[PDB]
Design an enzyme around this catalytic site. Structure first.
Site, short mmCIF file in Angstrom:
data_model
loop_
_atom_site.label_atom_id
_atom_site.label_comp_id
_atom_site.label_asym_id
_atom_site.label_seq_id
_atom_site.Cartn_x
_atom_site.Cartn_y
_atom_site.Cartn_z
N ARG B 92 -25.08 20.12 0.46
CA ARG B 92 -25.15 19.76 1.85
C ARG B 92 -24.76 21.04 2.82
O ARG B 92 -25.58 20.94 3.81
CB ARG B 92 -24.55 18.53 2.31
CG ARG B 92 -24.96 17.68 3.45
CD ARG B 92 -24.73 16.34 3.33
NE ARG B 92 -24.84 15.68 4.61
CZ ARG B 92 -25.14 14.38 4.97
NH1 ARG B 92 -26.01 13.99 4.17
NH2 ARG B 92 -25.44 14.07 6.33
N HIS B 178 -25.83 9.73 9.66
CA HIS B 178 -27.04 9.40 9.01
C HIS B 178 -26.62 10.15 7.61
O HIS B 178 -27.07 11.20 7.12
CB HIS B 178 -28.26 10.34 9.64
CG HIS B 178 -29.57 10.02 8.60
ND1 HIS B 178 -30.03 8.80 8.22
CD2 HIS B 178 -30.21 11.10 8.17
CE1 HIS B 178 -31.23 8.94 7.49
NE2 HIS B 178 -31.12 10.24 7.47
N1 LIG Z 1 -33.43 12.69 10.35
C1 LIG Z 1 -34.17 11.89 9.47
O1 LIG Z 1 -34.18 10.67 9.51
C2 LIG Z 1 -34.92 12.52 8.34
C3 LIG Z 1 -34.70 13.97 8.41
N2 LIG Z 1 -35.67 14.71 7.63
C4 LIG Z 1 -35.56 16.10 7.64
O2 LIG Z 1 -36.74 16.56 8.69
C5 LIG Z 1 -36.92 17.80 8.14
C6 LIG Z 1 -38.43 17.95 7.68
O3 LIG Z 1 -38.89 17.17 6.79
P1 LIG Z 1 -39.98 17.16 5.81
O4 LIG Z 1 -41.13 17.08 7.05
O5 LIG Z 1 -40.09 15.90 5.00
O6 LIG Z 1 -40.19 18.63 5.42
P2 LIG Z 1 -41.35 19.57 4.80
O7 LIG Z 1 -40.96 20.52 3.95
O8 LIG Z 1 -42.46 18.64 4.46
O9 LIG Z 1 -41.58 20.41 6.07
C7 LIG Z 1 -40.65 21.03 6.83
C8 LIG Z 1 -41.06 21.74 8.02
O10 LIG Z 1 -40.42 22.91 8.34
C9 LIG Z 1 -40.83 24.11 8.41
N3 LIG Z 1 -40.17 25.32 8.01
C10 LIG Z 1 -39.78 25.46 6.67
N4 LIG Z 1 -38.98 26.46 6.58
C11 LIG Z 1 -38.90 26.89 7.86
C12 LIG Z 1 -38.17 28.03 8.38
N5 LIG Z 1 -37.43 28.95 7.68
N6 LIG Z 1 -38.52 28.15 9.66
C13 LIG Z 1 -39.06 27.55 10.41
N7 LIG Z 1 -39.90 26.49 10.05
C14 LIG Z 1 -39.62 26.18 8.53
C15 LIG Z 1 -42.16 23.89 7.66
O11 LIG Z 1 -43.18 24.54 7.98
P3 LIG Z 1 -43.98 25.70 6.95
O12 LIG Z 1 -44.93 24.74 6.49
O13 LIG Z 1 -44.25 26.92 7.70
O14 LIG Z 1 -43.08 25.96 6.00
C16 LIG Z 1 -42.62 22.44 7.83
O15 LIG Z 1 -43.23 22.15 9.10
C17 LIG Z 1 -36.05 18.15 7.15
O16 LIG Z 1 -35.09 19.22 7.60
C18 LIG Z 1 -35.54 17.01 6.55
O17 LIG Z 1 -34.29 17.12 5.83
C19 LIG Z 1 -36.49 14.26 6.68
C20 LIG Z 1 -36.44 12.75 6.56
C21 LIG Z 1 -35.92 11.93 7.54
#
Ligand SMILES: NC(=O)C1=CN([C@@H]2O[C@H](COP(=O)(O)OP(=O)(O)OC[C@H]3O[C@@H](n4cnc5c(N)ncnc54)[C@H](OP(=O)(O)O)[C@@H]3O)[C@@H](O)[C@H]2O)C=CC1
Ligand SMILES: NC(=O)C1=CN([C@@H]2O[C@H](COP(=O)(O)OP(=O)(O)OC[C@H]3O[C@@H](n4cnc5c(N)ncnc54)[C@H](OP(=O)(O)O)[C@@H]3O)[C@@H](O)[C@H]2O)C=CC1
Ligand code: NA
Ligand code: NA
Lengths: 312, 311
Positions: B92, B178
């Site tokens: 984590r 969370h």
């Molecule tokens: N707070 C809550 O209740 C919840 C939290 N989350 C969090 O939300 C976030 C998104 O989850 P999820 O949509 O399922 O994940 P996905 O992997 O499906 O999407 C991740 C997103 O982050 C972008 N991204 C990834 N790496 C980078 C980087 N190095 N720099 C910039 N942008 C980046 C991706 O863009 P690209 O396509 O360009 O890689 C994409 O738009 C995560 O951190 C997840 O842990 C999710 C579940 C619920």
């Protein structure tokens, strides 16, 4: 109302399961898939329930496999979004025959169990709608496909953006095949009820290039993001809402023709329909411009021939 | 209202871009991703427009890369769903260090161009909320995270199904992290305003088993379908609606503590808040039972430790 979604684990099936559950008149929904996908559906069910909590909505969601379709009994509408993914080692016609087999088995098996409306999404949707009608043995008002309802939505957006109005201020329709022989109806295209050819900026509206973009829009979305999703799902819910509340709207769906338009029969294709609680309440023979009418007859001939070639 | 979604190509980013666009008060929405994902966003934009046509809604959707965040200027709310995938032997803390770099740079570059609200989704959301607040230099009312608002929704479903009522007839909340130190509040759980402990069937309510299922609810959805999607997206829109229409509701979000609750400060974590047009308009110190309060203090210490280990 109770609805069943066959293909709920797919792209469109998952999105439409979510949007249907939100609807206040949908109290029970079956998510149905092949056995290999049941666990996907269980996660989909939990995720949708969470969304209902956040949005003030409610539903009774059940997950089932397609081995025993008796669970469909009591469904007012059964949406079929099942379909074989496109690959390179299969021709367009081979894929159509695979889907025709899937659609026939579901239609035959559902009809052993109950009378329901079959809302067909599986492509090629005009051919699959006809196949499901024949194999189910249902009445013609009970089987229909999304058809050019979806293309009409793509046309609507482009019109609204050109003239600078709220998207909902445009009403337009496309009849014929959900495909390249589709027939857009400029004679039935209006903003706030005003035919667009009476609007001052119409003279410079490149409507034929827009139509070309609509013809190519589905394949473009496939190329850019893998496949259409929210577009089709929202268009499906729109029709379901019209049926559930018996709205009686003049829409466009892939429906069985029985002589209303120039004596044409023995085909399902995109046509103007009045939709209500009985499904396709009538096919409405509106007055078409000559070019539109001839192009619609052409689309009918093309679709009838597709049907014969998939059957053979 | 104008909204910007950073991370719109992702799982939550895409679903939430669709739901936000449908909202009648959202007139302009920026879909923002890394340059390599812009083609995905172009298709998402087309698909959403098609959906708006089918549902009687409207919006102006623009696709932009994250190279120039000046496009965010004028956004009332900026939702950050960007984050790395948690891969293999990652702890984590490893996750938090990678995502904190992403969040730090977005918060600093956005603060260079404008004042906006930052609505943090990136995990660990309580830590990323604090990081965005400090790096942006914004006022504390302007930065908040989804936090236990989502877990509260999962608790609501479980309660409603046991008692056999419309899901919306339940109101309940979970405060704290969370995460697995989250603190459900049975003292603030009601059906039609009736505390559930005053309902006849409460004696047989398997409270402890239900709580354990809620705590594992996110992990379970990851196991079954790869990750949550509609739940989080809908919980985000619910908050945006409260801000956009200045509804003034007592909700739960990850927010900065400044002494309201037992003098606790220097941390963001799930707490009762009044939400309105200014965002977090106050942290509300409600009366907790003794065990709920001890559990909350534990959660605060755990989240503070994580903030330090990332510093
Ligand atoms: N707070 C809550 O209740 C919840 C939290 N989350 C969090 O939300 C976030 C998104 O989850 P999820 O949509 O399922 O994940 P996905 O992997 O499906 O999407 C991740 C997103 O982050 C972008 N991204 C990834 N790496 C980078 C980087 N190095 N720099 C910039 N942008 C980046 C991706 O863009 P690209 O396509 O360009 O890689 C994409 O738009 C995560 O951190 C997840 O842990 C999710 C579940 C619920
Ligand atoms: N008419 C229209 O407007 C549109 C039509 N479509 C059509 O709708 C269908 C679904 O599209 P989409 O959701 O994107 O596709 P997906 O590939 O994303 O989903 C396919 C669905 O069909 C199921 N399925 C696949 N193979 C079989 C099989 N042999 N027997 C039974 N079920 C099967 C899958 O179940 P499993 O998870 O078990 O594999 C899954 O539920 C396709 O035929 C597609 O061409 C799509 C776009 C718009
Ligand atoms: Na419902
Ligand atoms: Na809108």
């Amino acid at each position: 109302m109770k609805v069943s979604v066959i293909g709920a684990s797919g792209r469109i099936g998952s999105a439409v399961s979510f949007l249907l559950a939100k609807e206040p008149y949908i109290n029970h929904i079956n998510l149905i898939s092949r056995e290999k996908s049941l666990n996907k559906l269980k996660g989909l069910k939990m995720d949708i329930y969470d969304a209902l909590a956040a949005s003030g909505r409610d539903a009774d969601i059940e997950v089932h496999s397609d081995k025993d379709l008796s669970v469909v009994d009591g469904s007012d509408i059964t949406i079929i979004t099942a379909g074989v993914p496109r690959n390179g080692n299969m021709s367009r016609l081979d894929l159509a025959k695979e889907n025709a087999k899937i659609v026939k088995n579901y239609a035959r098996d559902i009809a052993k169990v109950c009378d329901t409306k079959l809302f067909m999404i599986t492509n090629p949707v005009d051919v699959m709608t006809y196949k499901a009608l024949i194999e189910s043995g249902y009445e013609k008002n009970q089987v229909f496909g999304l058809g050019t309802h979806l293309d009409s939505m793509r046309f609507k957006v482009a019109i609204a953006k050109y003239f600078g109005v709220h998207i909902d201020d445009v009403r337009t329709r496309i009849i014929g095949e959900h495909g390249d022989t589709m027939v857009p109806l400029l004679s039935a295209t209006a903003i706030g009820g005003i035919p667009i050819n009476r609007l001052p900026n119409f003279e410079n509206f490149p409507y034929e290039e827009v139509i070309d973009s609509v013809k190519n829009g589905g394949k473009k979305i496939i190329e850019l993001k893998g496949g259409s999703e929210y577009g089709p799902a929202s268009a499906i819910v729109n029709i379901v809402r019209c049926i559930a509340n018996d709205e009686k709207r003049l829409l466009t769906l892939s429906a069985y023709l029985d002589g209303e338009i120039d004596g044409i029969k023995d085909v399902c294709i995109g046509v103007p329909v009045k939709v209500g609680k009985n499904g396709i309440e009538e096919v409405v023979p509106i007055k078409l411009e000559d070019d539109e009418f001839e192009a619609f007859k052409h689309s009918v001939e093309v679709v009838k021939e597709y049907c014969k070639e998939v059957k053979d």
